């Protein structure tokens, strides 16, 4: 309609309006006396209209609602935080052009540029349980979903301390992304020997370059 599309936040409403909201929320920490906050105000109005159905813009006045911004380490204003499903997806400090704002939003609302052929299985086994048959077992089990190119049993130390925990990531590379997708949908969230497995895509370019750190 001819009405205000911005959500006007308070400290009391921040949790339900921002953290529990559906879809992406762009939060602007601002104040009435703030020059650059006024300068981006009409940009945010246009964004709220042009990104309707894809993004909600919200504003928290930090004079009238002083409790929330320090919990996010806000310093200068305006500061923009992009939230999705209760996570902070991106931050941007200070004023910016509409073109810069649209690139900041497009690059962070985008998602992935490609469905990967590589699946990673997390929380599946401990290092003590690894043996020489594990790679072959994963290969035969994941053959139910498609052609398996390669399986990597990767052990990763979780920190610099001597006693740091070691976790296992099992990488399964399929021949084409449609196979990877079937395996992920069928296995993600399933329980295996008392453990809830996470099965998800793993960045293909990283994997192709022997970067198994993600
Ligand atoms: Mg700040
Ligand atoms: Mg700052």
Author numbering: 343 to 556
Give the text the authors published on this PDB structure.
To confirm the binding pose of the compound we pursued crystallization attempts with other UHM domains. This approach is based on the observation that the ULM-binding pockets of UHM domains are highly conserved suggesting that our small molecule inhibitors will bind to other UHM domains using a similar binding mode. The absence of electron density of the ligand in the other two molecules of the asymmetric unit results from the fact that the binding site is blocked by symmetry-mates in the crystal. As expected, the phenothiazine moiety of 7,8-dimethoxyperphenazine occupies the tryptophan-binding pocket. The tricyclic ring system adopts a non-planar bent arrangement due to the presence of the sulfur heteroatom. The hexagonal ring attached to the 7,8-dimethoxy position forms π-stacking interaction with Phe534 of the UHM domain. The chlorine atom snuggly fits into the hydrophobic tryptophan-binding pocket of the UHM domain. The ion pair of the tertiary N14-amine group of the piperazine moiety interacts with the Glu483 sidechain, which in turn is stabilized via hydrogen bond with the side chain of Lys486.
UHM domains were first identified in both subunits of the U2AF heterodimer (U2AF65 and U2AF35). Structural analysis revealed that they represent non-canonical RNA recognition motif (RRM) domains with degenerate RNA binding motifs. Using high-throughput screening (HTS) of a highly curated library of 43296 drug-like molecules with biophysical assays monitoring binding to UHM domains, we identified phenothiazine derivatives as inhibitors of UHM-ULM interactions.
